[PDB]
A paper describes a structure:
BTN2A1 consists of extracellular domains (IgV and IgC), a transmembrane (TM) domain, a coiled-coil domain (JM), an intracellular B30.2 domain and a C-terminal tail. Although BTN2A1’s intracellular B30.2 domain shares around 50% sequence identity with BTN3A1’s intracellular B30.2 domain, our isothermal titration calorimetry (ITC) assays revealed that the BTN2A1 B30.2 domain does not bind to HMBPP, in contrast to the strong interaction between HMBPP and the BTN3A1 B30.2 domain. By contrast, no such basic pocket is evident in the corresponding region in the BTN2A1 B30.2 structure, explaining BTN2A1’s inability to bind to HMBPP. The monomeric BTN2A1 B30.2 can form a homodimer with another molecule through crystallographic symmetry, with the dimer interface burying an area of approximately 1,924 Å2. The extended C-terminal loop in each monomer contributes to the homodimer interface. Analysis using size-exclusion chromatography with multi-angle light scattering (SEC–MALS) confirmed that BTN2A1 B30.2 forms a homodimer in solution, and truncation of the C-terminal tail blocked homodimer formation.
Vγ9Vδ2 T cells—a major subtype of human circulating γδ T cells—respond to multiple cancers and infectious diseases in an MHC-independent manner; they are specifically activated by small, non-peptidic diphosphate metabolites called pAgs. The sensing of pAgs in target cells requires a surface protein, BTN3A112–17, that has both intracellular and extracellular domains. Here we show how—in both humans and alpaca—multiple pAgs function as ‘molecular glues’ to promote heteromeric association between the intracellular domains of BTN3A1 and the structurally similar butyrophilin BTN2A1. The BTN3A1–pAg complex functions as a composite interface that directly binds to BTN2A1, bridged by the pAg molecule at the centre of the interface.
Numbering used by the authors:
A (entry chain A), B (entry chain A): 323 to 521, 526 to 534
């Protein structure tokens, strides 16, 4: 019955080597330059060619959703994939291969990353909802400005656990995976209440 | 751990008699005129003076949130209350009486319905999130345009179950309680997917 508002954190062991994750692993950009790191170049979990990264959490049942900020990113993909998807080479990001996606490519939105399913959106998307109903075989996408439906993929027998999926098709342009709401978690609330609480990859550059 | 994105439906047995609920009990307005109905004028669950209505579901544990559309409503209150709150006469809608609220009154937003806690918001709110962390004693409010925090009430020992709470301080102006996202639930998904799916109290009037 209950819809889970997921708290998505990225899995750095899946991330293509050109992706730079925030310290909190909740935002990611593709950087043109290398950061000297501790990370294995080509462990089997890692996407080696497609500039992709997965959420750490997998879902095997139930209803789940999360939201992604994509303003100022010209090329991106969001959605869900099987935990078993192929990671190596020029993987086709299509349902038949275990990927259920929404893409921005060359100023258009494409259902299931298909040049034959251009979605006739009438505004630039800024915050996209990704929705999963596992048993119903449903991956759906929402415009979170007005909570309006964008697309539901053809219904699928997922069979294995699925994970949040992300692709960055352009450089120097971060996406932000919106944390689940937490209220005042961890924060002292004064006797009159806590007002307008505020707690970035936007400042990451290579011109130091 | 998990945040519940609640699907809130109103309880008509709590609603002040001047409130008119949509057929699906997910939106409400205060109407100046009577609708000939089947409803008891003054059952003990019903607010008799404060123009208020509760959600049907109560929460005794965990983290929960829901969202409310309030555009074009000049006077409204949203929040959480104890299931045990007083229903009769001119109840003071304050924490000490079991009400944790955010109010729009006379062009200002007021924390806990207090004329002494005017919130310095810099935009007109359109969609408000109401958040509960029961064990942490937390009722929080969010601006869902950008998922920004507005206010957390002083932390409270709720003790008994709590319910969604709504007040309509003006006439002919509906609030819409946003349904939990459902993807394509109940809807046939064509072989190419389902595109831009669309499924009102805005048309309710007394000039027939
Ligand atoms: Zn960099
Ligand atoms: Zn009416």
């Amino acid at each position: 019955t209950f819809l889970h508002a997921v708290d998505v954190v990225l899995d750095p062991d899946t991330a293509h080597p050109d992706l730079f994750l925030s310290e909190d692993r909740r935002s990611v950009r593709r950087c043109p330059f290398r950061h000297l790191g501790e990370s294995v170049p080509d462990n089997p979990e890692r996407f080696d060619s497609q500039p992709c990264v997965l959420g750490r959490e997998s879902f095997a049942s139930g209803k789940h959703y999360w939201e992604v900020e994509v303003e100022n990113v010209i090329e991106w993909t969001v959605g869900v994939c099987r935990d078993s998807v192929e990671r190596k080479g020029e993987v086709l990001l299509i349902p038949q291969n275990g990927f259920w996606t929404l893409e921005m490519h060359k100023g258009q939105y494409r259902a299931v990353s298909s040049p034959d399913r251009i979605l006739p959106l009438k505004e630039s998307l800024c915050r996209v909802g990704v929705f999963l109903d596992y048993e119903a075989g449903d991956v759906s996408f929402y415009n979170m400005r007005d909570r309006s439906h964008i697309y539901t993929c053809p219904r699928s027998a997922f069979s294995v656990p699925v994970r949040p999926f992300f692709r960055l098709g352009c450089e120097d342009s971060p996406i932000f995976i919106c944390p689940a709401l937490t209220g005042a978690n961890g924060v002292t609330v004064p006797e009159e209440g806590l007002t307008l609480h505020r707690v970035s990859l936007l400042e990451h550059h290579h011109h130091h």
